[PDB]
Design a protein around this nucleic acid. Structure first.
Ligand code: MG
Ligand code: MG
Ligand code: MG
Ligand code: MG
Ligand code: MG
Ligand code: MG
Length: 150
RNA sequence: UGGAGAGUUUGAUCCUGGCUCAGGGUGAACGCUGGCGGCGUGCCUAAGACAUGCAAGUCGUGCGGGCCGCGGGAUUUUACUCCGU
């Protein structure tokens, strides 16, 4: 069992002959706070089945978060559409200084000291997606070494 | 040792994009309120106009006087004159 926080719920709507037709979208993170997180986007006729559905997709979509005591190996910037995130390593004592969206994601990978900036489009969905791509993109001294040995 | 963002264009969406808020600051002023103290601080406007008092003197160990005193002398005649203070 991982942890699970709901970042976002929204109600969307389509049109049909006489009246609009509502739907709900749910952004949910799940994490063991020990270097494993997942993002999930779940949509349904009702909030619950949606949230719940998110949960399910979150766990099916997971990342190696190579913590190095509270923080991440190095800096990364990732663009996702018009959304951009910068992630920066911090010495212990700082905290997760981030916006609600990536805070949630960082916290549940058990990151505790990180400096972030949201740049470009601040649309939650894409910020969240960038954050994940960013983490998914972190290497460590080891991995680099492996890559370059040959 | 250092970096958080949110609201608002649509029936809904993504994006551009402006407006707006959350923080910090001030020689402040204004409203309601107002107990004590220490340390700071107080014409940002007319370099407009200014009553009155005070804000730059001191040296008699550089010099000679004037005015008000006091005291000594010369003459034994009282006026005149010398010295000290
Ligand atoms: Mg771009
Ligand atoms: Mg923008
Ligand atoms: Mg409006
Ligand atoms: Mg329009
Ligand atoms: Mg509307
Ligand atoms: Mg905007």
């Amino acid at each position: 069992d991982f942890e699970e926080k709901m970042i976002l719920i929204r109600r969307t709507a389509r049109m049909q002959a006489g009246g609009r037709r509502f739907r709900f979208g749910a952004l949910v993170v799940v994490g063991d706070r020990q270097g494993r997180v997942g993002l999930g986007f779940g949509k349904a006729p009702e909030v619950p089945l949606a949230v719940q559905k998110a949960g399910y997709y979150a766990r099916r979509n997971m990342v190696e978060v190579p913590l190095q005591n509270g923080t991440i190996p190095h800096e990364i910037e990732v663009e996702f559409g018009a959304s951009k995130i910068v992630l920066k390593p911090a010495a212990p004592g700082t905290g997760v200084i981030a916006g609600a969206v990536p805070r949630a994601i960082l916290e549940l990978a058990g990151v505790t000291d990180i400096l972030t900036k949201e740049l470009g489009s601040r649309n939650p969905i894409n910020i969240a997606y960038a954050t994940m791509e960013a983490l998914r993109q972190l290497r460590t001294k080891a991995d680099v070494e492996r890559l370059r040995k040959g």
